């Protein structure tokens, strides 16, 4: 049980709960995970699954976002939307609760990744508790392009659930008790005083 | 004097033959837009012919007798038949020939491989009668197919039920049969699956109970062999104890989990002799190295980068 401050590199790849406040909700985007293709002459429906550092809890070789357009036999392929599978994808930046941040320090924050039915569980400003797996991703400047290797690895929480902390009725239900007492009260004269003074 | 002939028609530009024992006709499917020996094959007879191997030729649409394999009656005693990537052939017509004639006294081996996905072919067990006051036509499937040691049907759109019916009818003997290839067949599903028409199910328990002493299996490219479906093979290990050589390569679904539990259960039989999982994306490196370290397979192949299966001359006679 953590917050974006006390979430620490010792916790990487462990299952964590973070108490915080939502900021910078990204737009929802559809993320391709399976592409389905009718083969023009072959008749078969070929397909391809896709991988990245967010779609899987464990590392697997990334599949780089390309639709295949030719069979092994060279026959051309027509991509099938609807049969192809896309998941909703969204990023939210959970900020530390400013009440918890100690003297003279800014609040830390981290990016939660949310897929499909966890998307838009919250909006900016919502106090929230998220549970997910804390992860590293990317090359962290170990790739030979980066002369500067003091930069740290990117890190995330891959979300497994999003609990909005609304508590520490917009249209009410009405029972026969309510119907009776509303009408019985309405026949009294001082309702304009009693209700307003309530 | 010519007993063995091999025509390899790499390119295109524009009577009784008792001597002949083996005919190979390999044709570049891109270039050879005809069937070179068609008139000879349909007219002549080649009675000594032990082996025939025809690949890449395009069966002409204009002659339905060619499409119905009527020529193929001309070759009795045909110990081996290999026929592959001949674009306009069909297993559908082939099984009509197997239905309506005692075309062969003995095939030791059959290898039929159409390329495109033709419509679903089912074993046509319909036995009509000319009249109710007359006998039915004898269906010659058994006496044709009884002898097979090797059955290869890779890619042929055969439905799983058709193969079970070959086993339940015992058209395939089961004792004589010792090696089986049904890779790349999309119309094969396994009893653990939930999303199918029932006639595409291959009851592996019924089949493995029928043909139990087979040595070699090939299910390569069979995407339908997901990890859940592999559980059928796990529980059916007692009915396949003769298996030495297994090919399930170029499967982009089968995780190393199924490999390990299959081999652990197989080891309850003394390791498996040979396993091919080249090109499989989900066979984890640590798992296969544990397979080697525990010596659960005597040889296991894991060339992840090997894109293709059709080793020419070894695995396929479709040209290049």
Swiss-Prot record, chain A:
Localization terms from the record: Nucleus
Source domain of life: Eukaryota
Note: Present with 35100 molecules/cell in log phase SD medium.
Assigned protein family: Belongs to the MCM family.
Quaternary context: Component of the MCM2-7 complex. The complex forms a toroidal hexameric ring with the proposed subunit order MCM2-MCM6-MCM4-MCM7-MCM3-MCM5; loaded onto DNA, forms a head-head double hexamer. Interacts with CSM1.
Function: Acts as a component of the MCM2-7 complex (MCM complex) which is the putative replicative helicase essential for 'once per cell cycle' DNA replication initiation and elongation in eukaryotic cells. The active ATPase sites in the MCM2-7 ring are formed through the interaction surfaces of two neighboring subunits such that a critical structure of a conserved arginine finger motif is provided in trans relative to the ATP-binding site of the Walker A box of the adjacent subunit. The six ATPase active sites, however, are likely to contribute differentially to the complex helicase activity.
Protein name (database record): DNA replication licensing factor MCM3
Organism encoding this protein: Saccharomyces cerevisiae (strain ATCC 204508 / S288c)
Gene: MCM3
From Swiss-Prot, chain B:
Localization (cell): Nucleus
LRR repeat start and end residues: 20-44, 75-100, 104-127, 145-169, 174-197, 211-232, 240-264
Domain of life the protein comes from: Eukaryota
Family recorded in the similarity comment: Belongs to the DIA2 family.
Subunit structure: Component of the SCF(DIA2) complex containing CDC53, SKP1, RBX1 and DIA2. Interacts with SKP1.
Free-text function comment from the UniProt entry: F-box protein component of a SCF (SKP1-CUL1-F-box protein) E3 ubiquitin-protein ligase complex which mediates the ubiquitination and subsequent proteasomal degradation of target proteins. Probably recognizes and binds to phosphorylated target proteins. The SCF(DIA2) complex is specifically involved in the pheromone induced degradation of phosphorylated TEC1. The SCF(DIA2) complex binds to DNA replication origins.
Entry protein name: Protein DIA2
Gene: DIA2
Shown residues in whole-protein numbering: 366 to 732 of 732
């Amino acid at each position: 049980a953590l917050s974006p401050r006390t979430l620490t590199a010792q916790h990487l790849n462990k299952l964590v709960s973070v108490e915080g406040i939502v900021t910078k909700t990204s737009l929802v985007r559809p993320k391709l995970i399976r592409s389905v293709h009718y083969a023009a002459k072959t008749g078969r429906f070929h397909y391809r699954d896709y991988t990245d550092a967010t779609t899987t809890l464990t590392t697997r070789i990334p599949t780089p976002a390309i639709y295949p357009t030719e069979d092994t036999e060279g026959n051309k392929l027509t991509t099938e939307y609807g049969y192809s599978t896309f998941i909703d994808h969204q990023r939210i930046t959970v900020q530390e609760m400013p009440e918890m941040a100690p003297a003279g320090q800014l609040p830390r924050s981290i990016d939660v990744i949310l897929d499909d039915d966890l998307v838009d569980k919250t909006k900016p400003g919502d106090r929230v508790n998220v549970v997910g797996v804390f992860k590293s991703l990317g090359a962290g400047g170990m790739n030979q392009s980066n002369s500067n290797t003091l930069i740290g690895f990117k890190t995330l929480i891959l979300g497994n659930t999003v609990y909005p902390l609304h508590a520490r009725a917009a249209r009410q239900m009405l029972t026969d008790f309510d119907i009776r007492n509303i009408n019985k009260l309405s026949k009294k004269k001082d309702i304009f005083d009693i209700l307003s003074q309530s | 004097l010519l007993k063995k002939i091999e025509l390899i028609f790499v390119n295109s530009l524009v009577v009784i033959y008792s001597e002949l024992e083996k005919i190979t006709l390999i044709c570049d499917k891109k270039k050879i837009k005809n069937f070179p020996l068609c008139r000879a094959l349909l007219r002549g007879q080649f009675p000594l012919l032990q082996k025939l191997t025809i690949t890449g030729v395009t069966f002409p649409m204009n002659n339905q007798d060619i499409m119905n394999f009527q020529w193929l009656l001309n070759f009795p005693d045909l110990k081996e038949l290999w026929i592959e990537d001949n674009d306009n052939c069909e297993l559908s017509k082939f099984l009509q020939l197997l239905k309506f004639s005692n075309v062969w006294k003995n095939l030791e081996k059959l290898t039929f491989r159409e390329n495109k996905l033709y419509p679903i072919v089912n074993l046509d067990e319909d036995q009509p009668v000319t009249n109710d006051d007359e006998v039915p036509s004898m269906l010659f499937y058994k006496e044709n197919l009884q002898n097979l040691e090797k059955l290869d049907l890779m890619g042929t759109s055969i439905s799983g039920s058709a193969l079970t019916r070959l086993c339940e009818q015992e058209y395939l003997d089961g004792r004589k049969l010792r090696s089986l290839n049904i890779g790349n067949c999309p119309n094969i599903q396994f009893p653990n699956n939930h999303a199918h028409t029932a006639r595409m199910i291959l009851d592996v328990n019924a089949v493995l109970k029928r043909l139990s002493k087979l040595e070699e299996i090939n299910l390569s490219h069979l995407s339908s062999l997901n990890d859940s479906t592999m559980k059928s093979f796990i529980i059916n290990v007692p009915f396949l104890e003769n298996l030495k050589r297994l090919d399930i390569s170029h499967n982009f679904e089968i995780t190393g989990i199924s490999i390990y539990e299959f081999l652990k259960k197989f080891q309850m039989d003394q390791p498996l002799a040979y396993l091919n999982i080249d090109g499989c994306s989900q066979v984890s490196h640590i798992t296969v190295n544990m397979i080697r370290a525990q010596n659960l397979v005597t040889q296991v192949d894991c060339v992840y980068e090997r894109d293709v299966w059709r080793k020419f001359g070894i695995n396929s006679y479709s040209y290049s």
